[model samples]
Target: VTLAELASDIQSQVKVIDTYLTEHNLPQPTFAPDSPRELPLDANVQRARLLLIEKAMALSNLAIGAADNLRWHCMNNKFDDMTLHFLARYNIFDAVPRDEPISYAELSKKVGLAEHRLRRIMSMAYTQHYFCTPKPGFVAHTSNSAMAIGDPLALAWILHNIEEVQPWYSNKLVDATMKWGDSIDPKHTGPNLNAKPGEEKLFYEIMEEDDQGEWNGVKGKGFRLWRLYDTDKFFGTGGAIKGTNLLRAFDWGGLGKATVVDIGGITGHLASTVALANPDLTFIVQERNQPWYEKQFYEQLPAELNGRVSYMPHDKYAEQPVKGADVYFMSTVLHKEPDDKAITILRRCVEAMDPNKSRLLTRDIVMDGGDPPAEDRAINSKEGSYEAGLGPTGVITRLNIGIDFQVLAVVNGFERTREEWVTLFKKADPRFALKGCIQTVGNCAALMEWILE
Candidate 1:
């Protein structure tokens, strides 16, 4: 689009957003410290806001000229993350006072960063609008930086990206890929390269053991990836909570007094939620032989759920222990395995599935390359609609693609598209037939169902 067209389009979209906010009597979204943490808007206005962003970006890029745009994009992008990583690692955001700006020297003493170094980093962060300067030599929180203080998940998300993923992305991807050369071994991927010399372990193993080399250079016990995501506060609102949309994504209640085998269900949290809601359904949570994890599973389980939910230490690669279960459920499991291993796990379930009564369910993120093929539309017709933040250019779509790369680089595993998922099932067993795949807005994982033909 031409510059004029882009600018006009952005202006029109801005008018739509402005009108919505004015009519609703909502404050304008801003970078001020007192700004609302989340912008409240109706679905239509939200769409307009997204469009405004796209158009605005295009207009700005055009105005700046392509050569300069490319130059800035490549140059100093590393510092953007590196600066944030330092602030997060040192708890600098927490040290800054919320009500008033702190001088660079005082803030430096509180967080342990040298005054000169803190100034350098904060200067870069100011340009990116992370933190604000009330006056000369004084730093304060912006809405973005303030989020890291109020929300634990926000900070954890930042640390996870900066500490766990950045090292692999920035340094080891090329070397790991070159050494492995399209190999599917999880132990040979990017995260493994960061482990102690001659130590071969998968990403999950490294996180679980926490015996790796200083977690990609962010030293100390304070930054554990597993604990970061596994906090009760984070999971309370997700995966297991009552009336969470995760339960609605699939028809767990429709199973009708069935038994579900939760393969590799760590702590049985997801299955416990489903069983609590669907009283008739029973769950057998299968996990690997971690004594402590197994103990925690039973200890955290409610007394009332004693008979309804049970945990079993079982190896996934071995023969399926509980055969002919009505539902074979796996949540976010296969994504960690390569194709050959994933196919083997599926085949084990296939053998255990009753040809007449059993159904297999796998819940994971389904990657999007672009528009769906005709068959995908047909399969998703029942549950899929115009998912606003799930389209190709949407925020959730971008996160999924980021995770898509993460699993690829870190574990030699990648997210699958609709066609690739279908192929995976077929390759495992011809008897397995696709029933439906349901994807909804705000839910990253799609629920895919298959039945033995």
Candidate 2:
């Protein structure tokens, strides 16, 4: 989009947000001074906020990149990742006083980095809202960093992204693409070979899940690999009040008193989230587990949910044991395998489904052509290298493209378009009819609803 037109689009979007926020009695999302960490807006209001973000960022990239745009792409984004890791790995949040800003020297000493260097790296984060320079020459938590350090789960998320996924993209994605050619073989991706060598297990099978390394990386920094429980907890909006947002992704009221199976539900955490949100719903935590850990993770759910949310050792590939549950929920599981294996899992669920009563609900990335809010979409690409920004402009938009390749690098899986989803689901069983889809404001995932024909 032309810069002038983008500027106009951003103006209208901003006005829409201002109206929505005022109507909802919500504050503008920010970190300049202390503000509420999460936006309090509901669906429609949240859409305004998101649309505002989309256009504003698109305008930003156009503003920054369209002008002698060479330097824009060449800015070479890093120092930020290292800086973020430097803080998270060292538990810099723990040492920093939340009420009062700390001087750079003491902050450096507390973490054992050189004072000037610490200040240098921190400002890199400061600009990004992981921290803030509140008082002159002193740093303190913004709502952003406060939100970060307040929960160990958030820190684990940062470390997880940095460790679990990022390296494969920069280091291994190209090699996998070249090696695999057009093959969608799950066993052939680069991440399969990047670690254990010669052996191939898609990313999940490689790292395994829930039960992982010890939970003691706080004081010192092994930034890449994080500890066990917190690492598992960090996935998908974490299971805090932040996770309460989980309830927002789907229609729970209609699920009243019905049985729900969380397919591939790890440790019953997310299932517990859904169960609590709907007191009428009963849930089964269906996950692949090794007996002992199965019970170990199962018991981790709240005692209150004990009767309502139960657990079973369930392999998604096996014939589904929780036969004909009212709702079968799978979050971010399908993208873990090649198309063939994904189909096998779906067909198994299909076998277990009762055509009269069953529904399959999936929440996962629906890759947009680039989440530009503007209909006049323009993504400047040359020879497979992506350069331009999409809706909301900055680094945030990069992740959608980033995850696609990460999935490809690890497994021959991908984020599908809406039509692709329909096709893929149909491939599993023609009886598995596509009912409807509700695209959430966030493009990262959507509620794809299905019922057996």
List TM-scores for all candidates, in order: 0.76, 0.81
Q: How would you encode candidate 1's per-residue C-alpha lDDT over 139-239 as one tens digit per residue?
A: 99998787677555555666766877677543677888787687667777776665676777666665656644333223443236335434423443432
Per-residue alpha-carbon lDDT of candidate 2 for residues 34-132, written as tens digits (9 for 90 to 100): 576555434444444555566676666666765646664456356667787888887888778776789987888888888887778788887777777
Highest lDDT scorer: 1
The runs of at least 3 residues in candidate 2 whose Cα sits more than 4 Å from the true structure, single-residue gaps closed, are: 66-72, 191-202, 209-213, 216-235, 238-250, 290-299, 368-399
Score residue 78 of candidate 2 by CA lDDT.
61
lDDT score at residue 62, model 2, on the 0-100 scale? 68
Give the TM-score (vs. native) of candidate 2: 0.81
List lDDT for all candidates, in order.
0.72, 0.65
Question: What would you estimate as the lDDT of candidate 1?
Answer: 0.72
Residue pairs that clash (backbone atoms under 3 angstroms), model 1: none
